[PDB]
Amino acid sequence: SMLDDAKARLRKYDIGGKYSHLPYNKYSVLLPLVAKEGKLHLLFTVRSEKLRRAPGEVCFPGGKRDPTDMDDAATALREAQEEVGLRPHQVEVVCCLVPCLIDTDTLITPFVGLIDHNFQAQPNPAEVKDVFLVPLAYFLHPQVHDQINHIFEYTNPEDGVTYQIKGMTANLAVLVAFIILEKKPT
Ligand SMILES: Cc1cccc(CC(=O)Nc2ccon2)c1
User: Fold this and answer.
1) Do 142 and 152 contact (CB within 8 A), yes or no?
2) Domain ranges of the chain
3) Are the C-beta atoms of 136 and 111 separated by less than 8 Å?
4) Atom 14 in ligand 1: which residue has the minimum CA distance?
5) 3-class secondary structure, 51
6) Transmembrane segments in this chain: where?
7) Cα 131 to ligand 1 centre (Å)
8) Closest Cα to residue 173, out of 33, 75, 76?
9) Which is nearest to 80 in space by CA: 131, 29, 126?
10) At what angle do helices 167-181 and 2-11 cross, to 10 degrees?
11) SS (H, E, C) 70-97
12) What's the CA gap between 26 and 112, in Å, rounded?
């Protein structure tokens, strides 16, 4: 099936806990896969304009590890619950992708999660201004604008709203699309 095939692909890129004990400032993100209309989508947040770091930017759910977290995957799930109301029973964490090193002292660990079809986002307005889906296949043929560095523009055909996706967020989205969608019979 579509979902069994996605999970099988993802598991081949799982790094596991290999890098997890290293003494960094630690953050985790959840790359949430949603199946709608017979295709996979990624769920993105738009950060509240209130926040000091990157107000109004497109981001995956996530944040800083805290002492309660059993592991890095727990960080991602705790933060996702706080930001969009995603409960742990509503997500299957499939793998841990390559971590992202930033600022010389920080390590961001991305986890891919399969999201239950009955989940409905409840954006927490203190943290998130908006939540939206993008079809995973978009990231194979994105609309690129050079700002100099590359920026994706995605227009939601439901409402005509355009979102800008860039940086680590854009890079991770492409990675997930390659892993899941490369070399598939039609
Ligand atoms: C890609 C990336 C980079 C930095 C931090 C995060 C986690 C995060 O803060 N997600 C939030 C917060 C509010 O809405 N989404 C993710």
Assistant:
1) yes
2) 1-186
3) no
4) 47
5) coil
6) none
7) 12
8) 33
9) 29
10) 110
11) CCHHHHHHHHHHHHHCCCHHHEEEEEEC
12) 17
